[PDB]
Design an enzyme around this catalytic site. Structure first.
Site, short mmCIF file in Angstrom:
data_model
loop_
_atom_site.label_atom_id
_atom_site.label_comp_id
_atom_site.label_asym_id
_atom_site.label_seq_id
_atom_site.Cartn_x
_atom_site.Cartn_y
_atom_site.Cartn_z
N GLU A 35 0.82 -1.21 0.00
CA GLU A 35 0.00 0.00 0.00
C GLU A 35 0.86 1.27 0.00
O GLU A 35 0.57 2.20 -0.75
CB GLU A 35 -0.94 0.01 1.21
CG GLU A 35 -2.08 -1.00 1.17
CD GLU A 35 -3.19 -0.63 0.21
OE1 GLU A 35 -3.05 0.38 -0.51
OE2 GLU A 35 -4.21 -1.34 0.16
N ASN A 59 -8.67 5.37 3.44
CA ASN A 59 -9.41 6.17 2.46
C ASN A 59 -10.29 7.21 3.16
O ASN A 59 -10.98 6.90 4.13
CB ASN A 59 -10.27 5.20 1.63
CG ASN A 59 -10.85 5.81 0.36
OD1 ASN A 59 -11.02 7.03 0.24
ND2 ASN A 59 -11.20 4.94 -0.58
N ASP A 101 -15.19 -4.48 10.21
CA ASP A 101 -16.47 -4.01 9.70
C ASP A 101 -17.17 -5.04 8.82
O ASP A 101 -18.18 -4.71 8.19
CB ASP A 101 -16.31 -2.68 8.94
CG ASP A 101 -15.72 -2.84 7.54
OD1 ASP A 101 -15.39 -3.97 7.11
OD2 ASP A 101 -15.57 -1.80 6.85
C1 NDG Z 1 -9.17 0.31 3.83
C2 NDG Z 1 -8.86 1.31 2.74
O1 NDG Z 1 -9.05 2.51 2.93
N1 NDG Z 1 -8.38 0.82 1.58
C3 NDG Z 1 -8.03 1.63 0.44
C4 NDG Z 1 -9.12 1.57 -0.65
O2 NDG Z 1 -10.29 2.13 -0.10
C5 NDG Z 1 -8.70 2.24 -1.98
O3 NDG Z 1 -9.60 1.92 -3.01
C6 NDG Z 1 -7.26 1.91 -2.37
C7 NDG Z 1 -6.72 2.71 -3.55
O4 NDG Z 1 -5.51 2.14 -4.02
O5 NDG Z 1 -6.34 1.97 -1.28
C8 NDG Z 1 -6.63 1.28 -0.10
O6 NDG Z 1 -6.58 -0.12 -0.32
#
Ligand code: NDG
Ligand code: CL
Ligand code: CL
Ligand code: CL
Ligand code: CL
Ligand code: NA
Length: 129
Positions: A35, A59, A101
């Site tokens: 990420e 997000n 969730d």
């Molecule tokens: C838990 C969370 O916020 N995950 C986010 C997702 O919402 C988003 O679409 C993505 C974009 O690359 O990044 C992360 O995976």
């Protein structure tokens, strides 16, 4: 802050992520790797105008407030900038709510596509925990 791999595993373990909702520590370290490349200051803009923040790319559509995602929620009750701190407490606390969730770690697209079903233990291999 750009964490080292074992440095981040330790901090995640101290904050109670290891086996949180059944996800072993290697899942959380792998998720952070793909990420954010372990960078607490990572941001990325989504097509709908929301933004993902921090080491777990959380997000603004649902989880934090950045003042520029109209119609969104702030379910973790935090400014998104708190997710960019060198201290990962805010990110970990919010991750615990997300993963609880109903959808598990499938909420992290990079975990689903690059960690799920792999040898995630490799990511904490050699770390003193
Ligand atoms: C838990 C969370 O916020 N995950 C986010 C997702 O919402 C988003 O679409 C993505 C974009 O690359 O990044 C992360 O995976
Ligand atoms: Cl693991
Ligand atoms: Cl907003
Ligand atoms: Cl920390
Ligand atoms: Cl699950
Ligand atoms: Na928001």
């Amino acid at each position: 802050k750009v964490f080292g791999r074992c440095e981040l595993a330790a901090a995640m373990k101290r904050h109670g992520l290891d086996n949180y909702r059944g996800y072993s520590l290697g899942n959380w370290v792998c998720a952070a790797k793909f990420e954010s490349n372990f960078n607490t200051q990572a941001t990325n803009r989504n097509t709908d105008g929301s933004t993902d923040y921090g080491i777990l790319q959380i997000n603004s559509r649902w989880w934090c407030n950045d003042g520029r995602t109209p119609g969104s929620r702030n379910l973790c009750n935090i400014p998104c900038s708190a997710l960019l701190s060198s201290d990962i407490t805010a990110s970990v606390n919010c991750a615990k709510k997300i993963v609880s969730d109903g959808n598990g770690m499938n909420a992290w697209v990079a975990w689903r596509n690059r960690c799920k079903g792999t040898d995630v233990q490799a990511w904490i291999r050699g770390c003193r925990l």
